[PDB]
Amino acid sequence: AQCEATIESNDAMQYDLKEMVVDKSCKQFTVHLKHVGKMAKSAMGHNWVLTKEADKEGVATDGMNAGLAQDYVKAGDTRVIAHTKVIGGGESDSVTFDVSKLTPGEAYAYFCSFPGHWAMHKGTLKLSN
Amino acid sequence: AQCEATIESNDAMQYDLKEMVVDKSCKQFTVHLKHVGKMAKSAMGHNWVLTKEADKEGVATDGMNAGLAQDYVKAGDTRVIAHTKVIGGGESDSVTFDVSKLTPGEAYAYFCSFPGHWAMHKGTLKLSN
Ligand SMILES: [Cu+2]
Ligand SMILES: [Cu+2]
């Protein structure tokens, strides 16, 4: 069954999916982030960033410190398995990554690194079952 | 009551009051900010900053750049009419300011300068009898 998932953000602080499962038949997985709100990214931009659960607050703060033009993700951050661009209302962005980067059975953190979003705007990703 | 107002913030990005009126008999005005949420201030802290509407973005950018130890307000910022400290869930902080810093007729901007909150977490203050 497919290896692509659409996850949505809006003008509030939550994704519509608090958890995501990457099916084990997949060699590559694409995440399609949609910002279905109406606020511009200067007020309520959102992105989607994937890391080991341990690396989350670190990535999140170096990311906030990287600025809006870097999509609030430190350029070349080794801890980021995959990330989207920061988008604003009515926009989308997608990222594809190699599923071999994930360990079967490990919970991974995904979150938004837009200033003030990482602790609320998050969820957990794992390989199926 | 007289020349005091209480305003609340929670674990989302908005105040319970979108408009605040300072009575014209007031020489001093006190704002009691309460954070009725339960999230940690490094996760979803909030403050209340009052400026002219033309200075809001300048204050919020330099506020952001000032860091949490400065309650995300640049120290000695001339455009800041008044500001609270940044509080987290289950805390409160107050600030009293001199109303002659305000001009009758003008609408003033109050907002939260915590990273990512300035353009959403906001309202208008006006002087009226
Ligand atoms: Cu976000
Ligand atoms: Cu706030």
Element spanning A62, H or E: helix A56-64
Closest-lying ligand to the alpha carbon of A120? 1
Domains in chain A with CATH codes: 1-129 (2.60.40.420)
Q: Give the whole-angstrom CA distance, residue A15 versus residue A34.
A: 10
Q: Chain A contacts of B12, Cβ < 8 Å?
A: 12-13
Q: In terms of CA atoms, which chain B residue is nearest residue A72?
A: B116
Report yes or no: B11 and B38 within 8 Å, Cβ to Cβ. Answer: yes
Residues 6+ apart with CB under 8 A from A29: A3, A4, A5, A22, A96, A97, A99
CB nearest to B44's CB, from A39, A42, A119: A119
Which of B109, B118, B105 has the alpha carbon at shortest distance from B19?
B109
Q: Give the whole-angstrom CA distance, residue B5 versus residue B79.
A: 22
B116–A119 CB contact, under 8 Å: no
Task: Give me the residues of B, 60-89, that contact A with CB < 8 A.
Answer: 64
Q: Chain A contacts of B44, Cβ < 8 Å?
A: 116, 119-120
Q: Chain A contacts of B115, Cβ < 8 Å?
A: 64, 115-116
Let me know the angle formed at the C-alpha of B116 by B115 and B118, rounded to the nearest 5 degrees: 95
User: What is the DSSP-derived secondary structure letter of residue B46?
Assistant: B
Which of B9, B13, B12, B29 has the alpha carbon at shortest distance from B21?
B29
